[PDB]
Enzyme design. Structure first.
Site, PDB file in Angstrom:
ATOM      1  N   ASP A 121      -3.239  -1.171   3.921  1.00 33.02           N
ATOM      2  CA  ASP A 121      -3.407  -1.769   2.607  1.00 33.02           C
ATOM      3  C   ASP A 121      -4.496  -2.865   2.565  1.00 33.02           C
ATOM      4  O   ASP A 121      -4.427  -3.743   1.703  1.00 33.02           O
ATOM      5  CB  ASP A 121      -2.067  -2.354   2.116  1.00 33.02           C
ATOM      6  CG  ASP A 121      -1.887  -2.344   0.608  1.00 33.02           C
ATOM      7  OD1 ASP A 121      -2.670  -1.708  -0.145  1.00 33.02           O
ATOM      8  OD2 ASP A 121      -0.877  -3.000   0.184  1.00 33.02           O
ATOM      9  N   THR A 169       5.134  -5.420   8.477  1.00 30.95           N
ATOM     10  CA  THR A 169       4.964  -5.445   7.040  1.00 30.95           C
ATOM     11  C   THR A 169       3.907  -4.438   6.561  1.00 30.95           C
ATOM     12  O   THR A 169       3.629  -4.295   5.375  1.00 30.95           O
ATOM     13  CB  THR A 169       4.687  -6.895   6.578  1.00 30.95           C
ATOM     14  OG1 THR A 169       3.490  -7.360   7.192  1.00 30.95           O
ATOM     15  CG2 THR A 169       5.890  -7.810   6.944  1.00 30.95           C
ATOM     16  N   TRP A 193       7.669  -7.912  -1.660  1.00 29.62           N
ATOM     17  CA  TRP A 193       8.135  -7.091  -0.597  1.00 29.62           C
ATOM     18  C   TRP A 193       8.102  -7.696   0.806  1.00 29.62           C
ATOM     19  O   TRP A 193       9.142  -7.922   1.423  1.00 29.62           O
ATOM     20  CB  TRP A 193       7.302  -5.830  -0.575  1.00 29.62           C
ATOM     21  CG  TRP A 193       7.028  -4.968  -1.821  1.00 29.62           C
ATOM     22  CD1 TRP A 193       7.784  -3.934  -2.298  1.00 29.62           C
ATOM     23  CD2 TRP A 193       5.848  -4.995  -2.633  1.00 29.62           C
ATOM     24  NE1 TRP A 193       7.168  -3.351  -3.376  1.00 29.62           N
ATOM     25  CE2 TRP A 193       5.981  -3.973  -3.602  1.00 29.62           C
ATOM     26  CE3 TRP A 193       4.705  -5.793  -2.650  1.00 29.62           C
ATOM     27  CZ2 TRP A 193       5.016  -3.729  -4.559  1.00 29.62           C
ATOM     28  CZ3 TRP A 193       3.756  -5.554  -3.584  1.00 29.62           C
ATOM     29  CH2 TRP A 193       3.909  -4.526  -4.543  1.00 29.62           C
ATOM     30  N   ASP A 194       6.909  -7.943   1.342  1.00 30.15           N
ATOM     31  CA  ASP A 194       6.792  -8.416   2.721  1.00 30.15           C
ATOM     32  C   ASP A 194       7.306  -9.854   2.940  1.00 30.15           C
ATOM     33  O   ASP A 194       7.714 -10.213   4.046  1.00 30.15           O
ATOM     34  CB  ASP A 194       5.334  -8.328   3.178  1.00 30.15           C
ATOM     35  CG  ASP A 194       4.770  -6.926   3.127  1.00 30.15           C
ATOM     36  OD1 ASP A 194       5.512  -5.963   2.904  1.00 30.15           O
ATOM     37  OD2 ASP A 194       3.519  -6.779   3.309  1.00 30.15           O
ATOM     38  N   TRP A 247      -6.742  -0.987  -4.090  1.00 35.52           N
ATOM     39  CA  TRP A 247      -5.743  -1.902  -3.564  1.00 35.52           C
ATOM     40  C   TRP A 247      -6.198  -2.581  -2.279  1.00 35.52           C
ATOM     41  O   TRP A 247      -5.863  -3.747  -2.012  1.00 35.52           O
ATOM     42  CB  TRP A 247      -4.430  -1.173  -3.228  1.00 35.52           C
ATOM     43  CG  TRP A 247      -3.764  -0.521  -4.365  1.00 35.52           C
ATOM     44  CD1 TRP A 247      -4.233  -0.383  -5.653  1.00 35.52           C
ATOM     45  CD2 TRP A 247      -2.522   0.151  -4.317  1.00 35.52           C
ATOM     46  NE1 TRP A 247      -3.323   0.319  -6.408  1.00 35.52           N
ATOM     47  CE2 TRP A 247      -2.265   0.659  -5.606  1.00 35.52           C
ATOM     48  CE3 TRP A 247      -1.596   0.382  -3.304  1.00 35.52           C
ATOM     49  CZ2 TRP A 247      -1.086   1.374  -5.911  1.00 35.52           C
ATOM     50  CZ3 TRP A 247      -0.428   1.093  -3.595  1.00 35.52           C
ATOM     51  CH2 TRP A 247      -0.191   1.580  -4.897  1.00 35.52           C
ATOM     52  N   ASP A 268       1.558  -9.559   2.645  1.00 39.03           N
ATOM     53  CA  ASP A 268       1.497  -9.711   4.105  1.00 39.03           C
ATOM     54  C   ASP A 268       1.143 -11.143   4.471  1.00 39.03           C
ATOM     55  O   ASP A 268       1.691 -11.704   5.437  1.00 39.03           O
ATOM     56  CB  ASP A 268       0.474  -8.778   4.753  1.00 39.03           C
ATOM     57  CG  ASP A 268       0.806  -7.311   4.542  1.00 39.03           C
ATOM     58  OD1 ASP A 268       1.475  -6.746   5.427  1.00 39.03           O
ATOM     59  OD2 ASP A 268       0.443  -6.725   3.483  1.00 39.03           O
ATOM     60  N   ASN A 281       4.449   2.254   2.810  1.00 32.40           N
ATOM     61  CA  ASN A 281       4.334   2.011   4.255  1.00 32.40           C
ATOM     62  C   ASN A 281       4.749   3.215   5.103  1.00 32.40           C
ATOM     63  O   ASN A 281       4.120   3.482   6.128  1.00 32.40           O
ATOM     64  CB  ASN A 281       5.063   0.769   4.707  1.00 32.40           C
ATOM     65  CG  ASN A 281       4.436  -0.520   4.201  1.00 32.40           C
ATOM     66  OD1 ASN A 281       3.343  -0.546   3.596  1.00 32.40           O
ATOM     67  ND2 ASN A 281       5.126  -1.608   4.443  1.00 32.40           N
TER      68      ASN A 281
HETATM   69  O1  LIG Z   1       5.157  -0.363  -0.382  1.00 37.26           O
HETATM   70  C1  LIG Z   1       4.926  -1.801  -0.454  1.00 37.26           C
HETATM   71  C2  LIG Z   1       3.949  -2.352   0.610  1.00 37.26           C
HETATM   72  C3  LIG Z   1       4.223  -3.828   0.978  1.00 37.26           C
HETATM   73  O2  LIG Z   1       4.283  -3.977   2.417  1.00 37.26           O
HETATM   74  C4  LIG Z   1       3.153  -4.671   0.314  1.00 37.26           C
HETATM   75  O3  LIG Z   1       2.247  -5.242   1.260  1.00 37.26           O
HETATM   76  C5  LIG Z   1       2.377  -3.706  -0.561  1.00 37.26           C
HETATM   77  N1  LIG Z   1       2.547  -2.424   0.153  1.00 37.26           N
HETATM   78  C6  LIG Z   1       2.081  -1.188  -0.522  1.00 37.26           C
HETATM   79  C7  LIG Z   1       2.098  -1.143  -2.040  1.00 37.26           C
HETATM   80  C8  LIG Z   1       3.069  -0.496  -2.829  1.00 37.26           C
HETATM   81  S1  LIG Z   1       2.695  -0.642  -4.517  1.00 37.26           S
HETATM   82  C9  LIG Z   1       1.288  -1.550  -4.274  1.00 37.26           C
HETATM   83  C10 LIG Z   1       0.293  -2.132  -5.193  1.00 37.26           C
HETATM   84  O4  LIG Z   1       0.403  -2.003  -6.432  1.00 37.26           O
HETATM   85  N2  LIG Z   1      -0.753  -2.803  -4.638  1.00 37.26           N
HETATM   86  C11 LIG Z   1      -0.920  -2.966  -3.310  1.00 37.26           C
HETATM   87  N3  LIG Z   1      -0.050  -2.469  -2.430  1.00 37.26           N
HETATM   88  C12 LIG Z   1       1.025  -1.787  -2.862  1.00 37.26           C
HETATM   89 CA   LIG Z   2       2.073  -4.888   3.759  1.00 36.81          CA
END
Ligand SMILES: OC[C@@H]1[C@@H](O)[C@@H](O)CN1Cc1csc2c(O)ncnc12
Ligand SMILES: [Ca+2]
Ligand SMILES: OC[C@@H]1[C@@H](O)[C@@H](O)CN1Cc1csc2c(O)ncnc12
Ligand SMILES: [Ca+2]
Ligand code: NI
Ligand code: NI
Ligand code: NI
Ligand code: NI
Ligand code: NI
Ligand code: NI
Ligand code: NI
Ligand code: NI
Ligand code: NI
Ligand code: NI
Ligand code: NI
Lengths: 327, 327
Positions: free
Chosen positions: B43, B140, B263-264, B86, B18, B189
């Site tokens: 998150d 995001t 990702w973001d 996380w 993010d 998300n």
């Molecule tokens: O599904 C991805 C979204 C994105 O928007 C990232 O910010 C992490 N977020 C969640 C996420 C999936 S695996 C994972 C991880 O391993 N650690 C922190 N966050 C995540």
């Molecule tokens: Ca995110």
């Protein structure tokens, strides 16, 4: 305190605080002549811990002209491995921008192959045995390398050790090894290789100073103090140490979530300033069984080491902040 | 591409990527006028994500004179919380030396109280509704804030949205939500608040561009590229982004252990360079049940969004490296 340097080897296992310890030692050449480092495949993947060791050596050589030194990967293997997720920390460090300054990468790429030829246990023995001065060994990982040297060479090795300053154990407080098969009484560095610890800690031929959880529990770095490195971000060592402590994960983070453990750093701080703690002579009976108490370091019935007590939070703080303005 | 800036709000949940997204947007004022940020307690722990948002805003204002903007903590709550370990990442970031430069701490301490007065959902509505230009919202984190605005204001809000560029979902590939009670088909998300996602994704009144796992799976940042930030360590944004990616833990680290998800960042990159990916119109049937498939975003029977496809690794790389030499 500034007029003569102790000859020191750092025997480490590549967690973030191992590298804080390394930075404390190497940043103070008036006090410490760092003549080598060993890396063990314990709280890191040894290739990663090796590379990070190398690059920190290279950075200090560039910035403050500290000597280059041999680095050796130990081939010691665990009795009980560290948790895999914890071991990744040195890989994270190896990717950090402050550990990828182009000059340091170039110099390490050049020096790496010669160091890869070393066997870590053998290097520890050779460096101690051939040194003109007696050597202070700082052990911030498990005791396997010290054990191997004592087993192979006996007094030919131990007679050349000034003292051995060790991070490990838990005497009058609980441990930190929480697994389905443990009772929580043991500390991780001991648990990784209990027979090695038994061999070293009660070796009557060396003077061991032990920073057990008794001492390390009382000197976390609070979030408020880690943030203080921001005021020094222009110094590479502040970018390094600030990030190393800010990165804390799992059981490196205390209960309240606003402070982190600094186990190995406090251990190296003792080499810089021996008055940082009081020492108590203690006989220990190291548990080498396969029971729930494996790795426990209880007081024996009836000394092995000098246990560190009541370490000074202020001295630790002042030493770390001064060291990290060095460059 | 350099002659007129899009008006943008970043609606984020405070993970490392993010903040990479935030840095990409804010570092490119020729392309993006960032008029606000929202932070959701998904998150991250929202207080931490808020403070990090603030300090990055302050750093850019200091260095490159980007405008200050309102920041609001959303009070949206999860249907399904992110894993607690996380969520600590933004606390780690808040302690980093590059996020504790004294000027930025001072300015944020000053601006913080006025921003604390904001409600995040309401701020998103107010900023969109009162903007002269139609606003591009970059989401995001979860879709809860967009959902609240659409539910409360309907077309009074959606008529003022240019487009909504969202990180979420998994259409033709597996998900990333692996729990005892899930089948692995859902993305996080969406899973955090499936009813919100259903409300937004198939809202016929907004143009949604969706960066689902389909696209994000193909653009990890390899360790070899993260190390590249070292060559730019003199730039604060390189210290930030390099550390953010080097810090990756848990399922941020790919299988082979030599690359990390982004990702973001890819999602924000689309706002900077819309040709970074091809768009496919797709009708989605969002799973809002409490079964193992909760949060799944499968293709419907018989469009809701434009799904990003085949994103350009090279364009992403070049954009990120240029953006992080800005200051
Ligand atoms: O599904 C991805 C979204 C994105 O928007 C990232 O910010 C992490 N977020 C969640 C996420 C999936 S695996 C994972 C991880 O391993 N650690 C922190 N966050 C995540
Ligand atoms: Ca995110
Ligand atoms: O027992 C402490 C020793 C020290 O030498 C530190 O390097 C961490 N190391 C192991 C250790 C205990 S908890 C914990 C943790 O949470 N993460 C990584 N390592 C550890
Ligand atoms: Ca250690
Ligand atoms: Ni002296
Ligand atoms: Ni030289
Ligand atoms: Ni040699
Ligand atoms: Ni974990
Ligand atoms: Ni052994
Ligand atoms: Ni201070
Ligand atoms: Ni233009
Ligand atoms: Ni100003
Ligand atoms: Ni306001
Ligand atoms: Ni909701
Ligand atoms: Ni490149």
């Amino acid at each position: 305190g500034s007029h003569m340097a102790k000859t020191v080897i750092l025997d480490h296992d590549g967690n973030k605080d191992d590298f804080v310890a390394m930075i404390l030692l190497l940043s103070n050449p008036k006090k410490v002549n760092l003549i080598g480092c060993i890396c063990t495949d314990a709280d890191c993947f040894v290739e990663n811990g090796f590379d990070v060791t190398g690059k920190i050596m290279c950075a200090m050589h560039r910035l403050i002209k500290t000597p280059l030194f041999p680095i050796g990967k130990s081939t010691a293997t665990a009795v009980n491995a560290f948790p895999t997720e914890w071991r990744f920390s040195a890989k994270n460090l190896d990717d950090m921008p402050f550990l990828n300054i182009v000059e340091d990468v170039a110099l390490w790429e050049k020096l790496k192959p010669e160091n890869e030829a070393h066997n870590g246990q053998q290097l520890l023995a050779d460096l101690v045995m051939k040194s003109k001065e007696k050597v202070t060994v700082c052990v911030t990982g498990p005791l396997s390398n010290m054990a191997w040297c004592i087993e192979k060479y006996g007094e030919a090795f131990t007679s050349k050790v000034e003292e051995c300053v060790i991070m490990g154990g838990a005497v009058d407080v609980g441990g930190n090894v929480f697994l389905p098969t443990t009772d929580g009484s043991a500390e991780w560095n001991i648990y990784w290789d209990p027979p090695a610890a038994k061999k070293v800690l009660c070796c009557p031929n060396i003077r061991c100073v032990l920073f057990s959880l008794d001492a390390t529990n009382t000197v976390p770095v609070r979030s408020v103090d880690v943030k203080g490195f921001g005021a020094q971000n222009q110094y590479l060592l502040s970018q390094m140490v600030g990030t190393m402590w800010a990165m804390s994960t799992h059981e490196e983070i205390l209960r309240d979530g606003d402070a982190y453990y600094a186990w190995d750093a406090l251990t190296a701080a003792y080499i810089l300033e021996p008055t940082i703690a009081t020492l108590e002579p203690v006989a220990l009976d190291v548990d080498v069984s396969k029971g729930k108490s494996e790795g426990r370091t209880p007081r024996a019935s009836g000394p092995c080491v000098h246990v560190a007590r009541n370490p000074s939070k202020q001295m630790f703080h002042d030493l770390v902040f001064a060291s990290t303005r060095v460059c």
